[PDB]
Amino acid sequence: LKLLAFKARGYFGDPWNVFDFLIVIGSIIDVILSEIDTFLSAFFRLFRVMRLIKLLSRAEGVRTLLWTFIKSF
Amino acid sequence: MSPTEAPKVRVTLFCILVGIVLAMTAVVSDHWAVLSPHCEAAHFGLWRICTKRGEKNCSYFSISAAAISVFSLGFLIMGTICALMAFRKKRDYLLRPASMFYVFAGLCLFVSLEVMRQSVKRMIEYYYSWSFACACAAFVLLFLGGISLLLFSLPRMPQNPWESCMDAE
């Protein structure tokens, strides 16, 4: 939906959308893996957990504080 | 022109041009293991298993790594089509997605590397000379020429209150 609503030009424009893309792709590969395993990598099951970082996309005090310090370091 | 014609983004993009072929050197050469019973000396790979004492008998049987390295060669094509098209028409947002598939193509050799190790561990010694340290130099190239291209391709931290990530111009 997001892609259809940003011709892909404005979707990949927001630094958070890129993170979203990353998560999605990895999560899918994880499933396909768990699949080609039983049809015939404990690094891909970590893409499920990373979704939580999105929450940091709404929190504006946390995000702000975070940036503030991550900008001094 | 500022994130796509800077030299710091083209040193990295030419570095990926090295790792695009060294991971292709590995995915065809079957030399990253030595069976050593003591003759039954066999050299493992993904696609062919060849036992050398000429009596060069190369054949197939490993499946996990092979299947996993379709994707490591799959992401690579899919990343370059984003990268080859992002140097023209003044679009640079596309540069960032390309950097995604080079981390993935990096990490889908690292499963392959781990998958090939189990085969030699379950099967007389082991030694890798020609194509494990090739792919462990194309893993470390594509995995780290992808994350650095990512941080070299984003707008960058503002560093001031007025500056914003993704803004006017």
UniProtKB/Swiss-Prot annotation, chain A:
<comment type="function">
    <text>Pore-forming, alpha-1S subunit of the voltage-gated calcium channel that gives rise to L-type calcium currents in skeletal muscle. Calcium channels containing the alpha-1S subunit play an important role in excitation-contraction coupling in skeletal muscle via their interaction with RYR1, which triggers Ca(2+) release from the sarcplasmic reticulum and ultimately results in muscle contraction. Long-lasting (L-type) calcium channels belong to the 'high-voltage activated' (HVA) group.</text>
</comment>
<feature type="topological domain" description="Cytoplasmic">
    <location>
        <begin position="5"/>
        <end position="14"/>
    </location>
</feature>
<comment type="similarity">
    <text>Belongs to the calcium channel alpha-1 subunit (TC 1.A.1.11) family. CACNA1S subfamily.</text>
</comment>
<comment type="subunit">
    <text>Component of a calcium channel complex consisting of a pore-forming alpha subunit (CACNA1S) and the ancillary subunits CACNB1 or CACNB2, CACNG1 and CACNA2D1. The channel complex contains alpha, beta, gamma and delta subunits in a 1:1:1:1 ratio, i.e. it contains either CACNB1 or CACNB2. CACNA1S channel activity is modulated by the auxiliary subunits (CACNB1 or CACNB2, CACNG1 and CACNA2D1). Interacts with DYSF and JSRP1. Interacts with RYR1. Interacts with STAC, STAC2 and STAC3 (via their SH3 domains). Interaction with STAC3 promotes expression at the cell membrane.</text>
</comment>
<feature type="transmembrane region" description="Helical; Name=S4 of repeat IV">
    <location>
        <begin position="41"/>
        <end position="59"/>
    </location>
</feature>
<protein>
    <recommendedName>
        <fullName>Voltage-dependent L-type calcium channel subunit alpha-1S</fullName>
    </recommendedName>
</protein>
<feature type="topological domain" description="Cytoplasmic">
    <location>
        <begin position="60"/>
        <end position="73"/>
    </location>
</feature>
<feature type="transmembrane region" description="Helical; Name=S3 of repeat IV">
    <location>
        <begin position="15"/>
        <end position="34"/>
    </location>
</feature>
UniProtKB/Swiss-Prot annotation, chain B:
<dbReference type="GO" id="GO:0005886">
    <property type="term" value="C:plasma membrane"/>
</dbReference>
<comment type="function">
    <text>Regulatory subunit of the voltage-gated calcium channel that gives rise to L-type calcium currents in skeletal muscle. Regulates channel inactivation kinetics.</text>
</comment>
<dbReference type="GO" id="GO:1990454">
    <property type="term" value="C:L-type voltage-gated calcium channel complex"/>
</dbReference>
<keyword id="KW-0851">Voltage-gated channel</keyword>
<feature type="transmembrane region" description="Helical">
    <location>
        <begin position="130"/>
        <end position="154"/>
    </location>
</feature>
<dbReference type="GO" id="GO:0030315">
    <property type="term" value="C:T-tubule"/>
</dbReference>
<dbReference type="GO" id="GO:0042383">
    <property type="term" value="C:sarcolemma"/>
</dbReference>
<keyword id="KW-0406">Ion transport</keyword>
<dbReference type="GO" id="GO:0005245">
    <property type="term" value="F:voltage-gated calcium channel activity"/>
</dbReference>
<keyword id="KW-1133">Transmembrane helix</keyword>
<feature type="transmembrane region" description="Helical">
    <location>
        <begin position="11"/>
        <end position="29"/>
    </location>
</feature>
<comment type="similarity">
    <text>Belongs to the PMP-22/EMP/MP20 family. CACNG subfamily.</text>
</comment>
<feature type="glycosylation site" description="N-linked (GlcNAc...) asparagine">
    <location>
        <position position="57"/>
    </location>
</feature>
<dbReference type="InterPro" id="IPR004031">
    <property type="entry name" value="PMP22/EMP/MP20/Claudin"/>
</dbReference>
<feature type="transmembrane region" description="Helical">
    <location>
        <begin position="67"/>
        <end position="87"/>
    </location>
</feature>
<protein>
    <recommendedName>
        <fullName>Voltage-dependent calcium channel gamma-1 subunit</fullName>
    </recommendedName>
</protein>
<keyword id="KW-0407">Ion channel</keyword>
<comment type="subunit">
    <text>Component of a calcium channel complex consisting of a pore-forming alpha subunit (CACNA1S) and the ancillary subunits CACNB1 or CACNB2, CACNG1 and CACNA2D1. The channel complex contains alpha, beta, gamma and delta subunits in a 1:1:1:1 ratio, i.e. it contains either CACNB1 or CACNB2.</text>
</comment>
<dbReference type="GO" id="GO:0005246">
    <property type="term" value="F:calcium channel regulator activity"/>
</dbReference>
<keyword id="KW-0106">Calcium</keyword>
<dbReference type="InterPro" id="IPR008368">
    <property type="entry name" value="VDCC_gsu"/>
</dbReference>
<keyword id="KW-1015">Disulfide bond</keyword>
